């Protein structure tokens, strides 16, 4: 993947079954270089028999998304609304006020999104603690991926909502996720359970730094008040701005039944097309350990999520533990390099 473009994969069920092993595989094919990959699961795989029974799930903290800005640069402000069922949510999503406009091609819809972003604030059913996987789904169950991320809770008892536990997202048209990498620069997995698509922008990890340097110049206030101000997940930048300032990026549209994977230090943003439901969580491979150790974290206390790297460095990098602890570990990350578990396929 020398061009670092977004790759899509179509595994059989035999290949699908072992999750960490398929991640090692797609990295053996260069997937991680894009920062984002699509995995279309096998036809016979479903995480849930039906979604008919969720009209009464509470969205405890729906968020109205107020967007201020102009000329491709915007900041999103969150207003917490009162708790709402998914049934109340969907009525509002599909009503005339909030529903998806009529469009021909996706490029038309994308245009309307960037034109109308600051108008008619939508509500995002974001960050809902839960899963829509049935108990017995063993393949790619976001509730239990069985990656080395599990060592956090194993060792310490610590669970971090949405990081080592699942989050559900009920979208409506024009609801947004701002530019970010994952907390601790982890991987993420996103499954779109049902509804209208979710569109994604991705910057390759090898160019992530150029993106942060540009964002610092575009929002200099924010930069002086926080090292990692993009971790607040309030910063929207249009693809035309990225392209005007020479940031490589790719785009892709996720459809119901599809998984997206994001990779360590892969900056992504996007928006929902209409009423939908996504489930996501973070995960890790051995390659992530170095990203974790090196992650530039929020210094102003808006983003509190911080994982102790000690257990990972002790277990998987015992040579460098005393050096690392003396603060002498000057390893440079090579973003093109697949995870060690990928040697099997290389
Ligand atoms: O769906 C959303 O709001 C955003 N999802 C992600 O950023 C992810 O899965 O990493
Ligand atoms: Ni993300
Ligand atoms: Zn901060």
Q: Report the candidate in 327, 282, 267 with the shortest Cα–Cα distance to residue 162.
A: 282
Tell me which of 168, 179, 190 to substitute to probe ligand 1's pocket, judged by most ligand atoms within 8 Å of the beta carbon: 190
Residues β-bridged to residue 169: 278
Q: Report the candidate in 212, 230, 219, 216 with the shortest Cα–Cα distance to residue 300.
A: 230
Q: From ligand 1's centre to the CA of 299, what distance in Å?
A: 22
Q: Tokens standing for 72?
A: 């491709």
Q: How far, in whole angstroms, is CA 49 from its chain's centroid?
A: 26
The sheet carrying 267-272 orders its strands as: 176-180, 267-272, 198-203, 250-254
Q: Report the candidate in 34, 82, 78 with the shortest Cα–Cα distance to residue 59.
A: 82
Multiple choice CATH, 6-346, 2.60.120.650, 3.40.50.2300, 3.50.50.60, 1.25.40.10: 2.60.120.650
Which residue, by CA, sits nearest to atom 9 of ligand 1?
190
Q: Please tell me if the CB atom of residue 188 comes closer than 6 angstroms to any atom of ligand 1.
A: yes
**What are the Cα distances from residue 254, in Å, to 142, 192, 261?**
17, 7, 11
115 is in an annotated binding site: no
**What phi, psi does 230 have (nearest 5°)?**
-60, -20
- Is residue 63 a contact partner of residue 77, using CB atoms and an 8 Å limit? no
> What CA–CA distance (Å, rounded) separates 48 from 133?
6
> What CA–CA distance (Å, rounded) separates 304 from 301?
6
> What CA–CA distance (Å, rounded) separates 241 from 120?
23
207 is in an annotated binding site: no
> What CA–CA distance (Å, rounded) separates 207 from 336?
11
- Is residue 263 a contact partner of residue 169, using CB atoms and an 8 Å limit? no
- Is residue 262 a contact partner of residue 281, using CB atoms and an 8 Å limit? no
Residues β-bridged to residue 177: 270
**What are the Cα distances from residue 90, in Å, to 49, 59, 85, 93, 252?**
20, 11, 9, 5, 25
- Ligand 1 atom with the shortest distance to the CA of 198: 1
**What phi, psi does 114 have (nearest 5°)?**
-75, -25
Q: Report the candidate in 263, 260, 268 with the shortest Cα–Cα distance to residue 187.
A: 263
- Is residue 204 a contact partner of residue 336, using CB atoms and an 8 Å limit? no
The residue extents of the domains of the chain are 6-346
Approach to solving: X-ray
Angstrom resolution of this structure: 2.2
268 is in an annotated binding site: yes
Tell me which of 39, 123, 161, 177 to substitute to probe ligand 1's pocket, judged by most ligand atoms within 8 Å of the beta carbon: 177
| Residue position matching structure tokens 């150790």 | 293
Q: Which residues does 322 contact at the CB level (< 8 Å), separation at least 6?
A: none
> What CA–CA distance (Å, rounded) separates 131 from 270?
22
The three-state DSSP-derived secondary structure of the chain is CCCCCCEEECCCHHHHCCHHHHHHHHHHCCHHHHCEEEECCCCCCCCCCCCCCCCCCEECCCEEEEEEEECCEEEEEEEECCCEEHHHHHHHHHCCCCCCCCCCCHHHHHHHHHHHCCCCCCEEEEEEECCCCCCCCCCCCCCCCCCHHHHHHHHHCCCCCCCCCCEEEEECCCCEEEEECCHHHCEEEEEEEEECCEEEEEECHHHHHHHHHHHHHHCHHHHHHCCCHHHHCCEEECHHHHHHCCCCCEEEEECCCCEEEECCCCEEEEEECCCEEEEEEEECCCCHHHHHHHCCCCCCCCCCCCCCCHHHHHHHCHHHHHHHHCCCCCCCCCCCCCCHHHHHHC
Q: Tokens standing for 194?
A: 């049902």
Active-site residue set: 162, 169, 180, 182, 268, 280
């Amino acid at each position: 993947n020398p061009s670092a473009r977004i790759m899509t994969f179509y595994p059989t069920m035999e290949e699908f079954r072992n999750f960490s092993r398929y991640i090692a595989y797609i990295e053996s094919q260069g997937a991680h270089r894009a920062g984002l990959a699509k995995v279309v699961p096998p036809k016979e795989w479903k995480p849930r028999a039906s979604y008919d029974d969720i009209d009464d799930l509470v969205i405890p903290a729906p968020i109205q998304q107020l967007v201020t800005g102009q000329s491709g640069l915007f900041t999103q402000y969150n207003i917490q609304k009162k708790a709402m069922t998914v049934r109340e949510f969907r009525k509002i999503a599909n009503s005339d006020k909030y529903c998806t406009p009529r469009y021909s091609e996706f490029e038309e819809l994308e245009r309307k999104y960037w034109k109308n972003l600051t108008f008619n604030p939508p509500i995002y059913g974001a960050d809902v603690n839960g899963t829509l996987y049935e108990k017995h789904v063993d393949e790619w169950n976001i509730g239990r991926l069985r990656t080395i991320l599990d060592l956090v809770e194993k060792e310490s008892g610590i669970t971090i909502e949405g990081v080592n536990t699942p989050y559900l997202y009920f979208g409506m048209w024009k609801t947004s996720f701002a530019w970010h990498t994952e907390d601790m620069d982890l991987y993420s997995i996103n499954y779109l359970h049902f509804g209208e698509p979710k569109s994604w922008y991705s910057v390759p990890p090898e160019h992530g730094k150029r993106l942060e340097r540009l964002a610092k110049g575009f929002f200099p206030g924010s930069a002086q008040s926080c090292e990692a101000f993009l971790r607040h997940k309030m910063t929207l930048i249009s693809p035309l701005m990225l392209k005007k300032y020479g940031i490589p990026f790719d785009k892709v549209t996720q459809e119901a039944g599809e998984f997206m994977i994001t990779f360590p230090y892969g900056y992504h943003a996007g928006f929902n097309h209409g009423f939908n439901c996504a489930e996501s969580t973070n995960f890790a491979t051995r390659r992530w350990i170095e990203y974790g150790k090196q992650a530039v974290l929020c210094s102003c206390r808006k983003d509190m999520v911080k994982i102790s790297m000690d257990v990972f460095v002790r277990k998987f990098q015992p040579e460098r533990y005393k050096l690392w602890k003396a603060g002498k570990d000057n390893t440079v990350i090579d973003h093109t390099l697949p995870t060690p578990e990928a040697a099997e396929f290389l």
